[PDB]
Each structure stands twice: as C-alpha cells, then as structure tokens.
Amino acid sequence: SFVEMVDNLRGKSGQGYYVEMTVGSPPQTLNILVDTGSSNFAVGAAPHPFLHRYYQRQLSSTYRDLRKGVYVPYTQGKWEGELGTDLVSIPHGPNVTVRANIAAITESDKFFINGSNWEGILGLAYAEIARPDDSLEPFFDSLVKQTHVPNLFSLQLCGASVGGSMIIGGIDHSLYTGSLWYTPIRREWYYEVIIVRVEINGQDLKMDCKEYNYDKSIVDSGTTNLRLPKKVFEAAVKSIKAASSTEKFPDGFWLGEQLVCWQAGTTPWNIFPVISLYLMGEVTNQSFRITILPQQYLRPVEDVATSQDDCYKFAISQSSTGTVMGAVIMEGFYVVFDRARKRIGFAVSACHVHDEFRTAAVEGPFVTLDMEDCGYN
C-alpha cells in the first residue's frame, strides 16, 4: 500500500518539504513541513501575514487543551504556543487517525516563510529533544503506539518546484537503485550518526575523524545546507576553492550570501569537486561512503538580474553545533529512518542528480579501523 505515499511531498527550494495532513474533527487541512531535525508537532494557530490558513481549535470537536505553554528555538527561527491534543490524519499516508500532541503556534519569529505554502512542522526525531521536555510524546511515537504502522519511515527528497516521497511505515523499493547501506543511529535524540572519513575529489581531508562529529553529526531534513564544524568547514572550502580556482568568486559567495551566475547552460560543473562522506557501517571495522555532486551543494536560486542565467548559492556553511547533513545532502538519496533497528539507510534515489561524467553514489564495503574513536564525547 506504499504506492499511495509516493510523491506525497512538495516544496520550494531552500524552504523545506511538506506533506498534507488534517487535524481536528471535522478535518482541517494543513501543509506540514517534514523535519527529522526536531521532535515537536506544531501548527500555525493564529493569523500571520505568511500563513494562508491556520489551525482553529475552536472549530474542532475533538480538541483537548493541555493547559501548558511551549516554545521551540531552532538554529534559525523560533515560535511559542499552547499545547493540546487532537486527531490527526495523513491523507496520502497510512489509512489511520491518531491522537497526537499539537503545539498551537500563537507567536513566531523568522519561522514561517513568505509564500512557502506550509503552515506547520512535523518533528520526526525522538522525545529526548522535544520541548518543553521529553515527556511530550512526538507524533511518530504516538503513531506507532496507537496503530499497526511499523516503526520506520523513509524519505526520498528530489531536487530542483520540488517534490518527494515520505513512505510512512516502510521501504518502497521502486524509489531507489542498488543496495541500501546502513549506519547506526548513535543515540536516539537527534538522528545522530558518526562520520568516519571525508574525501574531496578522492583526496582525504586527513583530519582527526572526531573533528567531523564535533560535537555531533545529525541527519536533518529541516535544514537546507550541509553544515560543518568550523575546522572542517575551513578545510573543505579551501579544498573546493583550489579545485575551482579556474574561476573566481566573491568571498561572500563562499559565506553563502552572494549568489554566482553563469550564462544559461554553461555552469562549469567539472571544476567543482565531489565530496565523499564515509559513515560507520553495521559490522566491525566496516564503513560505506556517500558521494555528493556539486549539483547538490550549489543550490539553484532565482536570477537577481534581468537575464536568463543559471544562478546558485554555496549550500555548505559553518556550524558551531556539529555536522548537519541537510536536505541538500539527502536529495538524490533514498534515506531510510529505521527506528526499529536503530539505523539509517542510504541508497541512490530514483530521482538522482545527473552530472555529465560523474554520479552520486552509495558504495561499500570499506574497511575503517577505530571507528568508535570518531564519536565525540
């Protein structure tokens, strides 16, 4: 019954992927951003200039007030609101209805996006990072507790407006090719993983692998960019600068601010390197790698001039809170969040990015000694 969920995601570039849901009785239809980087289910519940619609608790006969406030500060954006429960369904999802915790957003700051077409957020990570605390059961835990939906979901995020699939409860084999490669979920809070090696155009960055995971590495469909700890970001930009020194770019481009353009169809993809991230595998001393094309980390953006140029932003940026494998990394891969078996799977997506001479790949096995040393403590 998974075919009913294929292509159930839509989005705008840089603005998240959303799935259609209903809350309340009678059902109120809302678009909900799918966010593996957080754990609160929250919806616009009061007028906002960027909300086309919002949750009206007054109109739902199944709404229950929890008489408790809540606020969530993200890296970018925050909101506050009132906790409650209500019945929730996913029209292009499993055929079930769950009573779920819902944060009714009454105020927000740089959270909703002008013309994004989504009105709420589905935090898919674990209770340990839920606000106000881990006693607020996340939506997916409630779904698994109340239905027969198996305890896993998979995300196929497709590139450049954008679409994809969230397979709730399983793996749809028509969405990927090759083998799935699995990395352990290190700890059930974020979807935390361990990066054991980084190569750019086949050359090892040769850093202490702890640097790659300082102070954590997470898989986050709710963050656009690949975000790297300061030391790793600097090594990577230096290497990417050198590989592309044929041309020169404003250094504000390398900070993710200034866009760069080329005459339509003449983007010099060949001068940008591929990035390989090696992940801890399932067996002793075994890892695997995912390879990222420049078409993923050069995110296309609208032309700032009166031309029909191809314009892009550098979609790698610096982090102070660990590595973030964001949507730009996930695009072109089929990513299986196998919560039941505490692992995350990667495979080449059916909607993989296309270079002329190169290909995004998931490859293994590799031998990597001392992988446990790569985790930060």
Ligand SMILES: CC(C)c1cccc(CNC[C@@H](O)[C@@H]2C[C@H](C)CCOCCCCNc3cc(cc(Cl)n3)C(=O)N2)c1
């Ligand atoms: C709530 C707790 C657990 C917490 C605190 C800090 C970090 C995390 C890790 N996940 C962050 C993720 O949930 C959070 C969700 C957004 C607010 C969802 C709406 O935006 C989508 C369009 C912008 C995409 N681009 C983007 C997003 C974000 C940071 C950066 Cl630099 N770019 C970011 O902040 N996205 C989690």
